[PDB]
Amino acid sequence: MNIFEMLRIDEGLRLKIYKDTEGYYTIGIGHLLTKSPSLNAAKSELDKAIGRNTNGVITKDEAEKLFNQDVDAAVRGILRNAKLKPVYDSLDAVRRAALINMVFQMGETGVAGFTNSLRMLQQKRWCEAAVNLAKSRWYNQTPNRAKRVITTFCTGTWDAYK
């Protein structure tokens, strides 16, 4: 099991545009097209990224293609983040995977708002962290995924995912 297999399970496929949760134009594997509300730019966006006129319809190869870049794009923000990196390094493989998923999901920025929770991860207060983490909008917005992710951070294992 690994980050890739993980996100894939949390995100799902899609070859046609979609408004996620809080309705941003998303596609493929939880690949965000645009914050705006235009089916427009999303398509615009969509196209610059695929290097072609999608007219809103990608294939797998592509969706996966974006996917691999995304995952990859997330490790760097983490790495390029003065507040994430430190937590990241401190954690193990499985646990790192959860962090990445979070970030992949809400952004360097968004994740970094978990000041306390981040502090307990690096302090290793797994238990306190889970609770904390769960008492959030995130959890409230995506209870399931959110729970899978918390347990992982907490158990340090992949059990939530089988």
Side-chain angles (χ1 to χ4, degrees), residues 46-65:
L46 179 49
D47 313 336
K48 0 156 290 326
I50 307 284
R52 99 189 176 57
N53 185 101
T54 299
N55 196 13
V57 190
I58 49 155
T59 79
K60 243 211 105 283
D61 307 287
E62 339 192 289
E64 214 135 43
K65 192 176 171 199

Side-chain angles (χ1 to χ4, degrees), residues 97-108:
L99 196 68
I100 285 179
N101 182 330
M102 285 191 65
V103 178
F104 181 103
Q105 176 190 15
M106 19 179 131
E108 245 198 27

Side-chain angles (χ1 to χ4, degrees), residues 17-67:
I17 304 201
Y18 64 109
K19 257 153 146 186
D20 64 43
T21 305
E22 49 231 71
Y24 292 142
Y25 296 88
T26 289
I27 184 163
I29 320 192
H31 173 84
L32 211 178
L33 290 149
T34 189
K35 286 237 210 230
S36 123
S38 94
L39 182 106
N40 291 295
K43 219 150 127 186
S44 317
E45 280 310 326
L46 179 49
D47 313 336
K48 0 156 290 326
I50 307 284
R52 99 189 176 57
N53 185 101
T54 299
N55 196 13
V57 190
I58 49 155
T59 79
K60 243 211 105 283
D61 307 287
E62 339 192 289
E64 214 135 43
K65 192 176 171 199
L66 284 182
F67 180 40

Side-chain angles (χ1 to χ4, degrees), residues 7-23:
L7 280 180
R8 169 114 207 47
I9 287 180
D10 288 321
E11 294 288 2
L13 225 338
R14 37 222 281 189
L15 326 180
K16 155 159 233 221
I17 304 201
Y18 64 109
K19 257 153 146 186
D20 64 43
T21 305
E22 49 231 71

